[PDB]
């Protein structure tokens, strides 16, 4: 599924991401925009044997198990295919873990390069939440 900006904002809101660990909802929508262009089926296969999965491009070395990645830790305790659903629940639950496992939003390269230092509230401006 390819989400709309406001649709995604509301879904993330329903799942508790606004002000999760101090990160306002627009940070999360911004991160999804530049990680996957809001595509729940996005995959990026890395040359290091890992793969980035789903709307938040969660990586298979640390966070989910795809059975093909060396040094896999599966800290979200989920198969990576759960992150490719049209329902964003598994991705949000894992994203919460990624912040809770001590790193902040700097875990998402697209967030740090394209959202940090910008007006992230624009990503939810005009939306019904």
From Swiss-Prot:
Keyword tags: Allergen, Antimicrobial, Bacteriolytic enzyme, Disulfide bond, Glycosidase, Hydrolase, Secreted, Signal
Cellular compartment(s): Secreted
Active-site residues, record numbering mapped to chain: 35, 52
EC number: 3.2.1.17
Gene Ontology terms describing biological process: cell wall macromolecule catabolic process; defense response to bacterium; defense response to Gram-negative bacterium; defense response to Gram-positive bacterium; killing of cells of another organism
Alphabetized InterPro entries for the sequence: Glyco_hydro_22, Glyco_hydro_22_CS, Glyco_hydro_22_lys, Lysozyme-like_dom_sf
GO molecular function per UniProt: beta-N-acetylglucosaminidase activity; identical protein binding; lysozyme activity
Keyword Disulfide bond: yes
Highest taxon in the source lineage: Eukaryota
Main EC class the enzyme belongs to: hydrolase
Pfam families: Lys
Keyword set includes DNA-binding: no
Major localisation: secreted
Tissue: In the egg white and polymorphonuclear leukocytes.
Gene Ontology CC annotation, any one: extracellular space
Disulfide cysteine pairs (residue numbers): 6-127, 30-115, 64-80, 76-94
The reaction(s) this protein catalyses: Hydrolysis of (1->4)-beta-linkages between N-acetylmuramic acid and N-acetyl-D-glucosamine residues in a peptidoglycan and between N-acetyl-D-glucosamine residues in chitodextrins
Residues that bind substrate: 101
Domain C-type lysozyme: 1-129
Miscellaneous comment in the UniProt entry for this protein: Lysozyme C is capable of both hydrolysis and transglycosylation; it also shows a slight esterase activity. It acts rapidly on both peptide-substituted and unsubstituted peptidoglycan, and slowly on chitin oligosaccharides.
Self-association state and partner proteins as the record states: Monomer.
Functional description taken from the UniProt entry: Lysozymes have primarily a bacteriolytic function; those in tissues and body fluids are associated with the monocyte-macrophage system and enhance the activity of immunoagents. Has bacteriolytic activity against M.luteus.
Similarity remark: Belongs to the glycosyl hydrolase 22 family.
Protein name, per record: Lysozyme C
